[PDB]
Write a protein that binds this ligand. Structure first.
Ligand SMILES: *Cc1c(COP(=O)(O)O)cnc(C)c1O
Ligand SMILES: *Cc1c(COP(=O)(O)O)cnc(C)c1O
Lengths: 383, 6, 391
């Protein structure tokens, strides 16, 4: 596979291109090609000529998905518990409304993927933040803070990213078991969003929250191939609901029909996608190794640790912002002064001041050009 | 307006 | 335009192993078989649409997508202007993942817990489902029927709107299952009742391009252009057999409701769904006309067959849709059937249709037959239906 390939994304209504010459390292989809094994599965579905009403019937899709989770993480789940949403955020918006009453609160660790908060906002649910701690360089959960807030406040639900966006943490069994125990003792529902779980560094292993904490039925798991196979546009996500009441609400109140092209694409990823995925992850790792060396040599006052998962780099530029008294958004700063689009702290809710997030799921030569421009803009008129 | 943003 | 191509609607297309609701899902929805039930076609989605999807796949990346710029709007509004003299502003156009999903959200935004919705009956079943999902109470207005020619009972509608707490009317234009293509006069009459009582109207126009030769479609918002509480829903899902792509147009002219919509529909579109729909509007006119001609011939055959073989059935060729609405009252009484007609025809005839239970109210004795199928398939199914009913 050729991850170096420059793929033209103009004239495709892509948010990454149209939503803001410029070097794009912002919105979380890849500049890598959706692999041909997936695209070819869509092409052979088109050869059946009819694109009518579709649902996941029979057990073939289930068999492909649970075979993936069993082989890769040793995680199994029941076919009855598997339901579908049109993307993970659409799923969260629905689950939050079913789980929470208007005076209930949700807990998120911060910094966070913005839509965790937005999904609470849309359901008129107040969010409580528990800031992650940075004291070993890697980020960690503040369990004391979490316990305090869950005990003292009316937290009904925790929305949790496993692995984490934007820090990249791949939580250990012990971290997850500890958090799960807190949630169980206080009757708190947990939605574990595991969309990054197959994008990870060679030396890391994913443990599903429902694997770490197998005897608590209020753990809801969300997984997709949208991030890992660059098929976010196909808007098809898996939700595993082990709680019978919620499952019944979903099955009753959830109006659900599926896109046949989305289903075949996702199924193909699970059945045939593993070889491409391993190769993508190896190329990503090399992008991260370059980025780590580059920051160490060229932006020494930046704080960065290679993330255990995701294709997203979380970079503390606090030093440079303070030394230059930069008073605009760092996204605006880099657009104006570097010609590079990144995601600034404003996208990550809380506990993000002075950080940018850089998407490096791009050809290595694109990444290097972007990083050079970021560096030049920051060190301009600095000693 | 990307739904990841706000 | 696609007028020069020779299409083959006789083609038999295998639907097994495609996760098709039509093939796999009749038990959950209704409760070797010949399938004449749920409203998708057995005709292929046209190659001009499929080729647009193939060309998008050649671009290699299926990432986050939205409808950027003016090209989609221009194609859609060019269609509505050409065909119905109906124009709207780009700012009023929003998108849903299918019309019923859109309806579910619209009903929640418009109606407070104590408000009621009005539907004319018989009705497409998901109009009621969309009110149930929002805990919104429905009031039925039975359509007047003369031998398969249905009309609105305007005195009944007026009376209900006046004396019930009706906030919203959900309306099919053209109508499913009766197939009526409403006249300007009929729509204007209903519009006056709604305006006088501050009732919102959602006009579901998904069948508007499937109709007999010589029929003209009038959008509700064209008939009643002065009122911003008319919402229009249109798609290529029925007309081009792309219901699985779940992409629909919603035209909201009321600023308050538009702003509300835009706070919960935070974009995110399917690139394949968008290019397919845009391809239909831009290039699909010739195939669509060929399809409608073939359909008209299916209806002519069905009309002849019922007159000859089931003369006690009541059936009028509908003005729109590919759905035949047939009154089998005589045969049901004679054979003394007291199970749902859909059960009866699966068990006794190996044919899947939709019965009265799927159309909410005012449907007793009727079945709906989907004839967007090759003529030879329709002939077989009708043969089995006849055999099950006659003495
Ligand atoms: C990228 C991302 C998603 C994607 O959500 P969609 O609604 O499918 O686009 C979801 N969750 C997390 C944690 C993410 O980082
Ligand atoms: C078939 C039909 C629909 C289908 O809507 P989708 O949700 O787009 O599948 C909608 N309205 C009417 C009146 C129909 O007959």
């Amino acid at each position: 596979y050729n991850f170096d390939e420059i793929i033209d994304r103009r004239y495709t209504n892509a948010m990454n291109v149209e939503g803001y010459e410029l070097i794009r390292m912002w919105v979380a989809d890849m500049d890598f090609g959706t692999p041909e094994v997936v695209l070819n599965a869509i092409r052979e579905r088109l050869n059946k000529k009819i694109l009518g009403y579709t649902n996941v019937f029979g057990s073939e899709y289930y068999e492909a998905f649970v075979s993936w989770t069993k082989k890769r993480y040793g995680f199994t789940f029941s076919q009855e518990h598997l339901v579908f949403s049109h993307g993970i955020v659409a799923g969260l918006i629905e689950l939050v409304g079913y789980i929470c009453d208007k005076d209930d609160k949700a807990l998120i660790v911060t910094p966070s993927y913005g839509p965790f908060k937005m999904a609470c906002d849309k359901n008129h649910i107040s969010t409580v933040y528990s800031p992650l701690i940075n004291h070993h360089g890697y980020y960690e959960i503040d369990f004391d803070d979490v316990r305090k807030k869950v005990e003292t406040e009316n937290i009904k639900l925790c929305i949790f990213a496993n692995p984490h966006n934007p820090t990249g943490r791949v939580w250990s069994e012990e971290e997850l078991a500890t958090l799960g125990q807190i949630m169980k003792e206080n009757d708190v529902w947990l939605i574990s969003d595991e969309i990054h779980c197959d994008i990870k560094r060679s030396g890391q292993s994913h443990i599903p929250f429902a694997k770490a904490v197998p005897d608590y039925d209020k753990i809801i798991t969300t997984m997709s191939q949208s991030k890992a196979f660059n098929i976010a546009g196909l808007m098809f996500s898996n939700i595993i609901i082990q709680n019978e009441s919620l499952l019944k609400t979903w099955n009753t109140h959830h109006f659900g029909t599926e896109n046949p092209l989305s289903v075949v694409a996702t199924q193909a990823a699970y059945e045939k996608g593993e070889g491409w995925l391993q190769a993508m992850n190896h190329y990503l790792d090399d992008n991260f190794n370059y980025l780590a060396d580059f920051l160490e040599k060229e932006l020494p006052h930046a704080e960065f640790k290679i993330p255990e998962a995701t294709y997203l780099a979380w970079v503390d530029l606090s030093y440079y912002i303070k030394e230059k008294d930069i008073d605009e958004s760092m996204a605006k700063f880099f657009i104006k002064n570097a010609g590079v689009i990144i995601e600034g702290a404003e996208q990550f809710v809380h506990n993000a001041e002075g950080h940018i997030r850089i998407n490096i799921a791009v050809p290595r030569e694109v990444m290097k050009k972007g990083l050079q421009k970021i560096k030049a803009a920051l060190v301009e008129n600095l000693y | 307006h990307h739904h990841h943003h706000h």
